[PDB]
Amino acid sequence: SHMVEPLIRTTISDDRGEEPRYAGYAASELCSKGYGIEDVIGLLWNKKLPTREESEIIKRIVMISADHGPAVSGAFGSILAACAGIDMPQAVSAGMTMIGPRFGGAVTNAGKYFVDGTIGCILMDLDFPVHSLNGFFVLARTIGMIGHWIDQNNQNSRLIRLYDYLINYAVKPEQEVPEK
Amino acid sequence: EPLIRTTISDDRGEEPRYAGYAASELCSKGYGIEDVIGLLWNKKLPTREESEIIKRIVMISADHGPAVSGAFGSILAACAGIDMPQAVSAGMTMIGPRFGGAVTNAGKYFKMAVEDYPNDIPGFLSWMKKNVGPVPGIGHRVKSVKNPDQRVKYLVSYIKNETSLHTPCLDYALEVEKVTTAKKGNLILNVDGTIGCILMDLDFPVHSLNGFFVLARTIGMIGHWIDQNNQNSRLIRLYDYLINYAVKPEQEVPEK
Amino acid sequence: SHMVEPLIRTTISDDRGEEPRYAGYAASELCSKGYGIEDVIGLLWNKKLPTREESEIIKRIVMISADHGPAVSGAFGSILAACAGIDMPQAVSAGMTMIGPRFGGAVTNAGKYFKMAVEDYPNDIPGFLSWMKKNVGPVPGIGHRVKSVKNPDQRVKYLVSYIKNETSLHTPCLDYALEVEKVTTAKKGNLILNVDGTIGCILMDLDFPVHSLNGFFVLARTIGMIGHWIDQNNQNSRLIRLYDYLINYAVKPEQEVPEK
Amino acid sequence: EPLIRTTISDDRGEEPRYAGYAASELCSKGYGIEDVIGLLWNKKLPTREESEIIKRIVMISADHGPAVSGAFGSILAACAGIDMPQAVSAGMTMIGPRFGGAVTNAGKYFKMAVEDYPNDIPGFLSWMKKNVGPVPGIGHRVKSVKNPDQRVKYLVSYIKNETSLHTPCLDYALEVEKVTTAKKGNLILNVDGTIGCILMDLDFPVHSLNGFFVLARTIGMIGHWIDQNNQNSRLIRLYDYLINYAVKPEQEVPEK
């Protein structure tokens, strides 16, 4: 036994009490008093209960951004993993990894410089923490990525191997290996 | 000819269609995030009652503090300076049979119990003890008959008294709880058992059940990433005393 | 003050000293004495310095499995993330997530089931195949999307030939899998002993830990996935959006949102 | 119209061709893993010198114990019962600016320092303080002047005494280290700085630089996953005494 310096410091949630507390509030009480998912987002990302106006905007941003079909990088990454027989959380994690400068992670930088731009601007105008901006697209698109994983599993989709005609093999001319 | 086949969403029009419905029209008519979840995972617009339950399941499942594998994985990546989506993806990778799996397994086994052991709770408990081990969704380290779980009491009371939904899995689990708690006080119906039963009773597709925990915990993981970044947290390196180095004896490398 | 206990127990490496010790051996001393990457693999995954024969086999398994073009799930996943502008480690992690029962990660299970077959079905390949069909589903290590009897996998042919002609290794698992292949290919030409099955059997015959088997494919294919990420970045490849004609939109008829 | 363009490998034949060379032919003629790395990342068969350096960088960097972010991430997933490739992918996600992935930036800034500040290390350090912040490739959590990193000492000695490599970046970084360590003992030239400088001095492709640590540390992360699985390690929950709960007081939810 000895003195321990904490490894981490947390300010948003705790589970040592009767039930988990999100920015000091019990989820059962948040449910009982008519709060929603958008309110829990505000608590865990902003440490305060959103106003009615903010709640309604958060709800709409998430609904509008939930999915944009299977062709886009996040959804396609989740589909590729679903077809490779990967379990849901790990498959969605591969799709989530695609979120960044070119696909849906432009919201934080576009709010900095002024649907990544309307949302980015709106979130800056709501004075939400700068570090939180990408969260709206990450969370919203997780709804769609889970959906695509379920869809492929319902269909028992087989492994994807990209068709040869879809690849430009701009490879080196074949050479013999020289003696070492 | 096609590389993939999709059935849930169409982005070819002016805006995406989720199971045939336009996203802006869902917003305009007062629908919520829980409605979009039902559309993309079940291809059906939830009823008001189903929507209220989906809402509560997501809110209750959003986070469980920083110590658990999901949140902690996101914190470890946040402290390593990794960007939010990739950091949250590392936390999400922890979700599986040991972390989050109790929900899906409780739904699976309580559904099996209703179907195969409708008038035989002892037979169900014996089959589980032989084939699975502890019953998923039963038991808690601190919650008990003497120390009840407020989230379970709330969720059960809400679906029983504030909706007209039919819950055969949850009803069966509540009968199981009467039997298990008589043996040992800590063998209560836990939050994972309550949610797993409710999801089966909502008739969501079997492949969808893990989605509720994955999506809800993404709210908490994003929150932990933001929290670490707001604090300017530093890189984590486990202290030497937190490691039991049960290593091989030191040896000289022999000549080839 | 608290009653502290270890959060983790480790047995493979010790970083406390001037440099890490891998299964008791100093990393720089392994370099100095002419050992290689394959020796470090043996130490960290098996806690034993490979013999020269084991070292030569490990080296070949990794070299032969390093890459198999951009069309396969792991390479394609790394390419998708590279084109999305994602940094190398995170992009390669998305490709690595694709390694599993259908692509590259059937090594562990192939080794497990062929070892079981040698023990429980030594002179009964049909019995083994029937048990697998009933209890597991497709046989891990059997089958390929492009390789077949007509289009053989020279990676498999090379590894088998190296083991058989250039080592004195006794290979009961590999021998049994080769007998299984004769039976499976007679039904369908694509039901060959694949790279995962070949590696899995060889590793079981080398008495490598059963938990280690998938490691060889995971590590080897990381070389290729990093290569694809570099390749796409050298080309300044743009974001990929799957062409509309490659998608069968079997979607619901469009509907108006009803009032609440 | 192709979806992707590839230049490094061809799998269409009887076996793959890596930058035009057949895999089994590389095996047959006595080449190694380090030669396959050179082919797939540089599209050129390494010289004897390059091959020996690649081999050593990978061996030296393979593992650094369970306490570091990438190993700890793989262990957390192993303990959560996640399969090896997905668990190692969570550990690999930790590689970035603070852990293992400073190689590219260290190479970039030391190369620039050789051109812009050849006889002015204080000028370089002042520019970095103002424009970047901490110098990539400088500093370590445990290694210091009092606790040297023998991995760094060995690689530097090997390059200097056992190769023909002209090393302006490495030489410059070693001069920087003399200045930084005089201020604070922990501001050593770290493994990321050492590898980054060596790779720039070898004129390897700039996009390849982080590959060496990513690949090498995958050996260690796989090793940790196997180790935890051999031990049948249970799910990790970070001990409460390791967390500083600076959380809001428990409070009643206000009415809407």
Coordinates of C-alpha atoms in Angstrom, one line a residue, chain C residues 70-222:
Chain C
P70 CA -5.5 -3.5 -53.3
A71 CA -8.7 -5.4 -54.0
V72 CA -8.7 -7.4 -50.7
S73 CA -10.6 -6.0 -47.7
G74 CA -7.6 -4.9 -45.5
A75 CA -5.7 -3.2 -48.3
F76 CA -9.0 -1.6 -49.6
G77 CA -9.9 -0.3 -46.1
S78 CA -6.4 1.3 -45.7
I79 CA -6.8 2.8 -49.2
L80 CA -10.3 4.2 -48.4
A81 CA -8.9 5.9 -45.2
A82 CA -5.7 7.1 -47.1
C83 CA -8.0 8.7 -49.7
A84 CA -10.1 10.2 -46.9
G85 CA -6.9 12.0 -45.7
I86 CA -6.6 9.9 -42.5
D87 CA -3.1 9.6 -40.9
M88 CA -1.2 6.4 -41.5
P89 CA -1.6 4.5 -38.1
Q90 CA -5.3 5.2 -38.0
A91 CA -5.8 4.3 -41.7
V92 CA -3.9 1.0 -41.3
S93 CA -6.0 0.3 -38.1
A94 CA -9.2 0.5 -40.3
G95 CA -7.7 -2.0 -42.8
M96 CA -6.5 -4.3 -39.9
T97 CA -10.1 -4.3 -38.5
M98 CA -11.1 -6.2 -41.7
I99 CA -8.9 -9.2 -40.8
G100 CA -11.2 -11.9 -39.5
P101 CA -13.0 -15.1 -40.4
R102 CA -13.5 -14.2 -44.1
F103 CA -10.2 -12.4 -44.8
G104 CA -6.8 -13.3 -43.4
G105 CA -7.8 -14.1 -39.8
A106 CA -8.8 -17.8 -40.3
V107 CA -5.2 -18.8 -39.4
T108 CA -5.9 -19.6 -35.7
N109 CA -9.1 -21.5 -36.4
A110 CA -7.6 -23.4 -39.3
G111 CA -4.7 -24.6 -37.1
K112 CA -7.2 -25.5 -34.3
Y113 CA -9.6 -27.5 -36.5
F114 CA -6.9 -29.3 -38.5
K115 CA -5.1 -30.2 -35.3
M116 CA -8.4 -31.6 -33.9
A117 CA -8.9 -33.5 -37.2
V118 CA -5.5 -35.2 -36.9
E119 CA -6.4 -36.3 -33.3
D120 CA -10.1 -37.2 -33.7
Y121 CA -10.6 -38.0 -37.4
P122 CA -7.1 -39.4 -38.5
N123 CA -8.5 -41.7 -41.1
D124 CA -11.9 -40.1 -41.6
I125 CA -11.8 -36.9 -43.7
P126 CA -15.6 -37.2 -44.5
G127 CA -16.4 -37.4 -40.8
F128 CA -14.3 -34.3 -40.1
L129 CA -16.0 -32.4 -43.0
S130 CA -19.5 -33.5 -41.7
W131 CA -18.6 -32.4 -38.1
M132 CA -17.4 -29.0 -39.4
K133 CA -20.5 -28.4 -41.6
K134 CA -22.8 -29.2 -38.5
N135 CA -20.8 -27.3 -35.8
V136 CA -18.7 -24.5 -37.4
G137 CA -19.9 -23.9 -41.0
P138 CA -17.3 -23.3 -43.8
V139 CA -13.9 -25.0 -43.0
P140 CA -11.4 -22.3 -41.9
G141 CA -8.4 -22.5 -44.3
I142 CA -10.4 -23.9 -47.2
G143 CA -11.6 -21.7 -50.1
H144 CA -10.6 -18.6 -52.1
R145 CA -12.4 -16.0 -54.2
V146 CA -9.9 -16.0 -57.1
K147 CA -7.4 -18.9 -56.4
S148 CA -8.5 -22.4 -57.5
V149 CA -7.3 -25.8 -59.0
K150 CA -7.2 -23.9 -62.4
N151 CA -5.6 -20.8 -60.9
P152 CA -3.2 -22.2 -58.1
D153 CA -1.8 -20.1 -55.3
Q154 CA 2.0 -20.2 -55.8
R155 CA 2.3 -18.8 -52.2
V156 CA 0.7 -22.0 -50.9
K157 CA 2.8 -24.2 -53.3
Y158 CA 6.0 -22.4 -52.3
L159 CA 5.5 -22.7 -48.5
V160 CA 4.5 -26.4 -48.8
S161 CA 7.6 -27.1 -51.1
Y162 CA 9.9 -25.2 -48.7
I163 CA 8.7 -27.2 -45.7
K164 CA 8.8 -30.6 -47.5
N165 CA 12.1 -30.1 -49.4
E166 CA 14.2 -27.7 -47.4
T167 CA 13.4 -28.6 -43.7
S168 CA 13.3 -31.8 -41.7
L169 CA 10.0 -30.8 -40.0
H170 CA 7.3 -33.4 -39.4
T171 CA 4.0 -31.9 -40.5
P172 CA 0.9 -34.0 -39.5
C173 CA -1.5 -31.0 -39.6
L174 CA -0.3 -29.8 -43.0
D175 CA -0.3 -33.3 -44.4
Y176 CA -3.9 -33.8 -43.3
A177 CA -5.0 -30.4 -44.7
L178 CA -3.4 -31.4 -48.0
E179 CA -5.5 -34.6 -48.0
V180 CA -8.7 -32.5 -47.1
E181 CA -7.9 -30.2 -50.1
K182 CA -7.9 -33.3 -52.5
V183 CA -11.5 -34.0 -51.2
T184 CA -12.8 -30.4 -51.2
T185 CA -11.4 -29.5 -54.6
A186 CA -13.1 -32.6 -56.1
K187 CA -16.5 -31.0 -55.2
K188 CA -15.6 -27.4 -56.2
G189 CA -12.4 -26.1 -57.8
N190 CA -12.2 -23.0 -55.6
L191 CA -12.1 -25.0 -52.3
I192 CA -8.3 -25.0 -52.2
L193 CA -6.1 -25.0 -49.1
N194 CA -5.7 -21.3 -48.8
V195 CA -2.8 -19.2 -47.3
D196 CA -4.5 -19.0 -43.9
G197 CA -4.9 -22.8 -43.8
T198 CA -1.3 -23.5 -45.0
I199 CA 0.2 -21.0 -42.4
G200 CA -2.1 -22.3 -39.6
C201 CA -1.1 -25.9 -40.2
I202 CA 2.6 -25.1 -40.5
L203 CA 2.5 -23.1 -37.2
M204 CA 0.7 -25.9 -35.4
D205 CA 3.4 -28.3 -36.7
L206 CA 6.0 -25.9 -35.3
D207 CA 4.2 -26.1 -31.9
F208 CA 3.6 -22.3 -31.9
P209 CA 1.0 -21.1 -29.3
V210 CA -2.6 -21.5 -30.6
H211 CA -3.4 -17.8 -29.7
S212 CA -0.5 -16.7 -31.8
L213 CA -1.5 -18.0 -35.2
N214 CA -3.4 -15.0 -36.6
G215 CA -0.5 -12.8 -35.6
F216 CA 1.6 -13.9 -38.7
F217 CA -1.1 -12.7 -41.1
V218 CA -1.9 -9.5 -39.0
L219 CA 1.8 -8.5 -38.9
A220 CA 2.7 -9.5 -42.5
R221 CA -0.4 -7.7 -44.0
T222 CA 0.5 -4.5 -42.0

